[PDB]
């Protein structure tokens, strides 16, 4: 039966005997727990290092994928020759190991990357101090903690103890977490800032409303867990920020799901608080928790403020964006249908401005390149699969019009860049406005109360041919030409060719208008930057293939690369004669040339050692003026060796004598640059 409530619990036996245990067993032979410490004070190491010191909460709060310290006191000193125990974390009334809701934590010699385990780091008298590491994919929620000692007759378990209940939150500081955000200032504003600013007014008369998110206030964390309980969200999916944010967009509005906030626009707001009176999220959520019924009343910005609290509270980085001239598409055709004005036939509408949320996560369900900011909206406007909810829609997918990737991207696109279509019905299309919708999209700046124009993340600039091509793509995701591109043998440090191929199998001559967008992506699939954008025209003679090779120079991307970065390419082309649109996106990993560094001889910090740097020419071309640099602050003054030429696929070796002058775990770094290939590196750790 479903396990969908954090508040519900099961009863874990304290004496889990097995088989027909004879009378008069002496269980005294085995360890028992006399006390557990979680070092959970808000001044102490766990909460400070886990960035949870701010919650008004007396229990331990930690973030997944990061280790924390606890201490277990036993009746006698733990002896691993005779004793075997394990820590357990448990959530729900129906915990299951294969569902992630019964989590046995083995005592291990060494913690391992991304796996639950506990390591003894200190022993004294009858106590052992443990460093516990949780999985970075762990379920978010309030866990019950037990210690289980194994005996030949069964398990001996600590009894229920709410003082050791432990909250595990999303971890933007953990690089193995789906919500990893590698910028501390960004983590401060989008996670730990509990006040903020929401923009409204008009494009030319822009107003500021302050908002208290209050995600650390007493009761709020518990309320957000209760929101998910009220949604009957299966616990096993609450470690997935896609599911958590999609549930949030449904549950924060009261339609369909008995959520938090009733919307009203009727200028009267009978028997409730009028939307403009709220100043923060705390009174709303806490009243929802206590009354267990929807709160009255909100509009766009209140929905987004309360949603922002939910996200940040759980650890999902989040911000509120404001779209000026926000379209409302009633028929899911991705344009504004304005009948000529006939107010009875015309069903679509435009808001002076609208508010919604962005949540930061990878998109493991989407192709590489669509992670990062996801638009999520809790203001009820349109049904998404029978419920009032919206998103996560990848802002990157919206920008290039790839609204085929879930969730609700066509709707969000229509909100930001739909055309106005003036229509006359009769016994006929009369005008087209392509700049009215979404004139400006903003969000609070980092470290201040001012605006940040972020329109360019959602759409290309009005009037640019790319804006048109992305919209035509958007409309196509709802003529006998084939289009494809391949990246011709791309090596890090060298230029390379992007070969876009059109095959015209018809007897017609076509003209093509097209753009290309080349991007750097983290290996987790989050986008980093566009480094090259071109629009170009080409004629397509009949019964012919045609390659258009695009040169991508090293200087265009080398200045923005990161470890394990891949490249993400968009190409969109319109057959002008047919208005047909061909759109493709592909990602590719750069080939990475190697530099191996060895050390011959002893590495004592007094005598001489020999550093062998090896490079192999990865290209079919001849490298020339190959400079090779060696750096190593404790081992060598910086040095360089030159090579006038390295023939194709040839290998050079460089021996360097060094006298290290410091002891410890230092490091050697090598670099190569030539007339063509440049800035390829190698590294080696060395102890002295």
């Amino acid at each position: 039966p479903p396990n969908n409530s954090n508040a519900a619990e099961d009863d874990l036996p304290t004496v889990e005997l097995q088989g027909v245990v004879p009378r008069g067993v002496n269980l005294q032979e085995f360890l028992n727990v006399t006390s557990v410490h979680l070092f959970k004070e808000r001044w102490d190491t766990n909460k400070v290092d886990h960035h949870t010191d701010k919650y008004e909460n007396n229990k331990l709060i930690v973030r997944r994928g990061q280790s924390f310290y606890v201490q277990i006191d036993f009746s006698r000193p733990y002896d691993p020759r005779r004793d075997l125990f394990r820590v357990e974390y448990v959530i729900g009334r129906y915990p299951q190991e294969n569902k992630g809701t019964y989590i046995p934590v083995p005592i291990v010699s060494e913690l391992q990357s991304g796996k639950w385990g506990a390591k003894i780091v200190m022993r004294e008298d009858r106590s052992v101090r443990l460093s516990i590491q949780s999985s970075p994919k762990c379920i978010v929620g309030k866990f019950r903690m037990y210690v289980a000692v194994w005996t030949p007759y069964g398990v001996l378990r600590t009894s229920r103890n709410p003082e050791t209940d432990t909250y595990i939150l999303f971890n933007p500081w953990c690089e193995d977490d789906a919500v990893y955000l590698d910028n501390e200032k960004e983590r401060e504003e989008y996670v730990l800032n509990d006040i903020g600013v929401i923009f409204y007014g008009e494009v030319n008369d822009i107003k500021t409303r302050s908002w208290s998110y209050g995600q650390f206030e007493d009761g709020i964390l518990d309320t957000c867990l209760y929101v998910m309980d009220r949604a009957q969200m299966d616990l096993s999916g609450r470690g997935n920020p896609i599911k958590v944010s999609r549930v949030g967009s449904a549950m924060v509005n009261a339609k369909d799901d008995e959520g938090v906030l009733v919307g009203s626009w009727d200028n009267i707001y009978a028997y409730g608080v009028p939307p403009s009176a709220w100043t923060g999220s705390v009174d709303i959520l806490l009243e929802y928790r206590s009354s267990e019924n929807p709160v009255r009343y909100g509009q766009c910005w209140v929905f987004a403020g309360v949603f922002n609290t939910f996200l940040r509270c759980l650890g999902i980085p989040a911000r509120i964006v404001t779209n000026y001239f926000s379209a409302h598409d009633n028929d899911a055709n991705l344009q504004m249908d304005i009948f000529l004005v006939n107010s009875k036939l015309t069903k679509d509408s435009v808001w002076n401005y609208h508010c919604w949320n962005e949540a930061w996560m990878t998109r493991p369900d989407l192709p590489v390149g669509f992670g990062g900011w996801q638009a999520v909206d809790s203001t009820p406007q349109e049904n998404s699969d029978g419920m009032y909810r919206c998103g996560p829609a990848s802002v990157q997918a919206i920008k290039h019009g790839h609204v085929c990737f879930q969730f609700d991207a066509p709707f969000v696109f229509a909100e930001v860049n739909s055309d106005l279509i003036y229509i006359t019905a009769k016994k006929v299309v009369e005008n087209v406005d392509a700049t009215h919708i979404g004139k400006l999209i903003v969000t609070k700046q980092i470290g201040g109360d001012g605006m940040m124009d972020i329109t360019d993340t959602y759409k290309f600039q009005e009037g640019q041919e790319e804006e048109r091509l992305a919209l035509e793509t958007a409309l196509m995701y709802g003529s006998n030409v084939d289009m494809d591109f391949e990246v011709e043998n791309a090596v890090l440090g060298k230029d390379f060719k992007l070969s876009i191929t059109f095959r015209n199998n018809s007897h017609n001559r076509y003209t093509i208008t097209a753009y290309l967008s080349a991007n750097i992506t983290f290996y987790t699939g989050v986008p980093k930057a566009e480094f090259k954008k071109e629009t170009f025209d080409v004629t397509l003679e009949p019964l012919s293939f045609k390659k258009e090779a695009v040169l991508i120079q090293a200087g265009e991307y080398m200045g923005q690369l990161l470890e394990q970065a891949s490249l993400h390419f968009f190409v969109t082309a319109r057959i002008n004669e047919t208005r047909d649109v061909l759109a493709k996106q592909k990602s590719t990993v750069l080939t990475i040339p190697e530099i191996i560094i060895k050390v011959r001889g002893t590495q004592v910090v007094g005598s001489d050692m020999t550093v062998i740097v090896e490079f192999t020419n990865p290209l079919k071309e001849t490298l020339r003026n190959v400079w090779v640099h060696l750096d190593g602050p404790g081992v060598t003054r910086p040095m360089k060796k030159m090579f006038r030429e390295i023939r194709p696929n040839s290998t050079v070796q460089w021996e360097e004598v060094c006298r290290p002058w410091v002891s410890g775990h230092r490091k050697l770094i090598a670099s190569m640059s030539s007339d063509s290939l440049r800035h390829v590196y190698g590294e080696l750790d060395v102890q002295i």
């Binding site: 409204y200 910005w301 509408s349 435009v350 808001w351 002076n352 106005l420």
Partner: peptide, 7 residues
């Protein structure tokens, strides 16, 4: 939040 009339 207001609905704006079509221009």
């Amino acid at each position: 939040x207001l609905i704006l009339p079509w221009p």
